């Protein structure tokens, strides 16, 4: 598994579960294309967006949507969403977990990136 | 000043001086439209980006080149941009800080929004 | 103002106000002696803790009272306090601003020395 | 195993490997009592610590040693060390992990509270 997404809520302590994630990829026209999506689980993660083979060289745009999730919860958040924006797999296949934890007012978003 | 922007670097402990930031203003057809940018000063602060008048509820997104900082310190970063995405609203409080903390391989973005 | 302190809240977005913070000193026989203490103003700062004559290089704890800000807004945290331990060098940067962002089960704390 | 701990470095965006974390509990003389201690594994870890039986209600601090872990990375840290300080198993008995993010200035700690 390729592309990892895990998202904590630093209000609850808890995962922050059925967060929706969209994935996008930069095409040579320069548009950002649908690349995959989903939602975390119960342990706040998601797995299985993509594969190794269709997880080629190019900028991809981790988009969560944090403001739908606090929405649910009764509270009323600053940020529309969180965008990670990085270029992957630019030194061959690379291993990518996006980890987010999220206040109604802050998100952190951190990177950890193993060679397999 | 309605929008003010801060940053902060978490290896050196320091403002992040001469960071580009980039503000768009969603449109109507839910493109982005340039609508402010400077770069940050020693203070790692950025000022005057708008103008009550100008400044209106809407969607928003401010951009932190965050690559070209870390680059020009010799240090290779995870992402190309930092990426803050908001609506400006009239109701509640109306000075907007966006704070961000900087890590190669991680950021933190904080919105202070005050009276 | 050699030592200053800046506090947030990430619920509310806003400066984190009436914040008590206490400083210590690690003493020759490694226990925490009170240095300095005060709680945080309307703008979530607290200046004027000690003067350059005071702030002599010593190991450093700087203690947030975080359980009682939550307290006092409804909410059940995790921590006792914050707790950021640090050397203070005459070397490098001399103005010490720790800043710190709380969430109820979440904080994160940055030093930013000046020049 | 009711108490974690996960420390990721965010200047390498990788685990933080070999970092000491002690563990202390507050007697009812108001002393810190050294409780458990270890070191991260390869994965950034440390489980172990601790047995249910073992982890009653009390105020633990958890002192994970940062200031060691970068001056081996040649970096000169801020911070002596973080100390995480809580209320443990005060509603009956929980597992906790303590996740902590790393830069030489800054960290973060963030908790996970579970009831098995
Ligand atoms: C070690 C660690 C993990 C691994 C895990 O939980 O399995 C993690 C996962 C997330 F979804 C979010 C944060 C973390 C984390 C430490 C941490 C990161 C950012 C902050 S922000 C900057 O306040 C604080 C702490
Ligand atoms: C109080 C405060 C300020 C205000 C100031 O210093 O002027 C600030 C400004 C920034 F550009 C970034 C962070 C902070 C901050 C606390 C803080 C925020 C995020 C993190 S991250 C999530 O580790 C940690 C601490």
């Given at each position: 598994?390729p ?10 302590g808890?995962?922050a579960?059925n ?7 930069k095409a ?7 690349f995959?999506?989903?939602?975390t ?7 299985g967006?993509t594969?190794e ?15 739908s ?18 270029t992957?797999?630019?030194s ?9 934890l999220?206040?109604p007012?802050?998100?952190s978003?951190?990177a ?5």
């Amino acid at each position: 598994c390729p592309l990892m997404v895990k998202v904590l809520d630093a209000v609850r302590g808890s995962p922050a579960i059925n967060v929706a994630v969209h994935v996008f990829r930069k095409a040579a026209d320069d548009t950002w294309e649908p690349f995959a999506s989903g939602k975390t689980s119960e342990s706040g993660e998601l797995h299985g967006l993509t594969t190794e083979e269709e997880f080629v060289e190019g900028i991809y745009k981790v988009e969560i949507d944090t403001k739908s999730y606090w929405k649910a919860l009764g509270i009323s958040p600053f940020h529309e969403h969180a965008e990670v924006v990085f270029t992957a797999n630019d030194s061959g296949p690379r291993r990518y977990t996006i980890a987010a934890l999220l206040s109604p007012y802050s998100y952190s978003t951190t990177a950890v990136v193993t060679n397999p």
